[PDB]
Amino acid sequence: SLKDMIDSIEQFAQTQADFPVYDCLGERRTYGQLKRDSDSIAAFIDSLALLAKSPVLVFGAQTYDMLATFVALTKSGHAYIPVDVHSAPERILAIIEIAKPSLIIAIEEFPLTIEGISLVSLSEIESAKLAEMPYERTHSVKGDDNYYIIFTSTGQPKGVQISHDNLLSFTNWMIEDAAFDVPKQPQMLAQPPYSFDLSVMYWAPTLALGGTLFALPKELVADFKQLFTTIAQLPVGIWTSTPSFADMAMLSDDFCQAKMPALTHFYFDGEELTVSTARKLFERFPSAKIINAYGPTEATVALSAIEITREMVDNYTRLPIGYPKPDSPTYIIDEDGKELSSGEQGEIIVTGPAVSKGYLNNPEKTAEAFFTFKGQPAYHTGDIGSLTEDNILLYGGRLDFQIKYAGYRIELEDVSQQLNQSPMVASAVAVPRYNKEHKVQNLLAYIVVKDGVKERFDRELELTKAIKASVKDHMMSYMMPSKFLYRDSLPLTPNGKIDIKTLINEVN
Ligand SMILES: Nc1ncnc2c1ncn2[C@@H]1O[C@H](COP(=O)(O)OP(=O)(O)OP(=O)(O)O)[C@@H](O)[C@H]1O
Numbered sequence: 001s002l003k004d005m006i007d008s009i010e011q012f013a014q015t016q017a018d019f020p021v022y023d024c025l026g027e028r029r030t031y032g033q034l035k036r037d038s039d040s041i042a043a044f045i046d047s048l049a050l051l052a053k054s055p056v057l058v059f060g061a062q063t064y065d066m067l068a069t070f071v072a073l074t075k076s077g078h079a080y081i082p083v084d085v086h087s088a089p090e091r092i093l094a095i096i097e098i099a100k101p102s103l104i105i106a107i108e109e110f111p112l113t114i115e116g117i118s119l120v121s122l123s124e125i126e127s128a129k130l131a132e133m134p135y136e137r138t139h140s141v142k143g144d145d146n147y148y149i150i151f152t153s154t155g156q157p158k159g160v161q162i163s164h165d166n167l168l169s170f171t172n173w174m175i176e177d178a179a180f181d182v183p184k185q186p187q188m189l190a191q192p193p194y195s196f197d198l199s200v201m202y203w204a205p206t207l208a209l210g211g212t213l214f215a216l217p218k219e220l221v222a223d224f225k226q227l228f229t230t231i232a233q234l235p236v237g238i239w240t241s242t243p244s245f246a247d248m249a250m251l252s253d254d255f256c257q258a259k260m261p262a263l264t265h266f267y268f269d270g271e272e273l274t275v276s277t278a279r280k281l282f283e284r285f286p287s288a289k290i291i292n293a294y295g296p297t298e299a300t301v302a303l304s305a306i307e308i309t310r311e312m313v314d315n316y317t318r319l320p321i322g323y324p325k326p327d328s329p330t331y332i333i334d335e336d337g338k339e340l341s342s343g344e345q346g347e348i349i350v351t352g353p354a355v356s357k358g359y360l361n362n363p364e365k366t367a368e369a370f371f372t373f374k375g376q377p378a379y380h381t382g383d384i385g386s387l388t389e390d391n392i393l394l395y396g397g398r399l400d401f402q403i404k405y406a407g408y409r410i411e412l413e414d415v416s417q418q419l420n421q422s423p424m425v426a427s428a429v430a431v432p433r434y435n436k437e438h439k440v441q442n443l444l445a446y447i448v449v450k451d452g453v454k455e456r457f458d459r460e461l462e463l464t465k466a467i468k469a470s471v472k473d474h475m476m477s478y479m480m481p482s483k484f485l486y487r488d489s490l491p492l493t494p495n496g497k498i499d500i501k502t503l504i505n506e507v508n
Pocket of ligand 1: 153272297398
């Protein structure tokens with residue numbers, strides 16, 4: 001039972017000094033090296049004489065130096081704020097205005113100029129490792145101390161603060177959980193950027209269990225042909241990503257058990273995992289375990305998980321989001337805040353030791369979303385779901401996407417997953433068209449169809465009717481959207497999710 005994240009990696013430094021913690025394409029760093037480098041960087045940090053417990057902004061991609069630096073900031077009592085290299089500069093500016101970092105560490109080159117705050121170069125961070133200064137922990141981040149602050153975009157950005165205690169509640173669960181079923185010294189693909197709290201689903205278990213991270217070069221992240229081929233050469237056992245990223249992977253010929261024989265586990269979190277995605281996945285990898293995991297950043301990465309089965313792919317029309325965690329009581333509530341019994345629909349709220357203390361310096365949004373329930377810190381997820389008698393959590397969608405149409409209670413994500421049932425559809429997004437009144441004139445759907453479908457059909461109209469014919473026996477009549485918008489792929493957010501908002505806007 002994990003007592004402290006640092007202690008763990010300190011132990012792997014004695015116990016397994018020569019085992020690799022990091023790998024970028026055969027270039028490697030070890031647990032012994034991570035201790036040595038992070039100790040030296042911590043000493044560097046203390047020498048700067050910053051405000052105690054002030055947060056530090058760390059700008060970069062996925063290199064070894066990001067991690068070594070994170071660990072140093074932890075050792076030396078400072079929350080880190082991962083900002084990813086591909087961020088809008090106005091966004092980077094926003095984070096700084098909100099968070100008031102005492103320092104910025106530019107692990108990759110920093111494309112803004114602000115006087116006011118100290119800036120530390122990559123070359124400086126390198127020099128520090130190579131100086132090899134020792135380090136004695138005396139004022140490491142503990143208890144409810146901020147460990148990291150991740151920024152969430154709804155439009156305007158907010159900074160979720162996650163404590164050492166929050167992180168340990170998530171991590172102890174992950175590594176004991178029968179769905180996740182994490183192997184010793186796990187060999188984890190490290191695709192999600194550090195600025196997305198999904199990165200935690202790989203670094204925290206890995207470090208807690210003595211594994212190895214497999215990172216990719218930043219210049220490789222836009223070349224989609226090379227990316228999946230390069231990935232396939234890697235001895236990775238676990239794939240951690242958003243469902244979308246794996247849909248993208250599903251185009252490559254090489255994303256199969258044949259070319260990736262070490263890969264046994266898929267960990268998905270962040271957006272709906274689709275029945276089809278799981279289907280294609282099991283074809284490509286018949287033996288692999290698949291895990292859907294759920295939660296907002298505000299409750300430390302994920303609060304429920306469950307293993308997805310073939311029974312589940314053969315029968316369900318939507319995949320469940322799993323067993324809530326023992327230490328995080330989860331509840332369904334109506335619009336007057338009363339707790340409902342199993343099967344009924346309402347907001348998903350979560351409580352307990354993994355619930356963030358709130359957004360940094362945004363007391364208004366904090367007061368909207370965080371509150372106390374049954375004596376315990378709680379968070380409004382904004383999601384509609386339900387809990388079953390056997391305690392499995394089910395996902396309905398976002399409150400902001402429950403709409404009224406022909407005076408109804410329509411969940412957009414329902415129309416989407418209904419349409420995704422059709423054999424000719426890869427990915428479907430139902431979307432509202434408005435008029436002058438902020439009222440709903442009609443439903444539309446964006447459609448991406450499967451391979452060899454576009455070419456069995458001479459005209460869009462045959463296709464649309466063929467599609468509607470394939471799920472009319474299931475779909476209620478008021479829910480079938482009238483118009484389809486075909487696309488070859490869907491836009492994604494920086495974090496790799498289907499960009500529902502932008503899709504809604506491009507029709508209004
Ligand atoms: N397994 C899942 N299935 C369905 N939906 C999910 C799942 N996991 C997460 N979500 C959705 O993602 C939300 C969490 O969002 P998150 O904390 O990533 O921030 P965000 O506001 O979506 O933007 P960003 O990703 O940039 O932070 C949940 O509210 C839920 O709507």
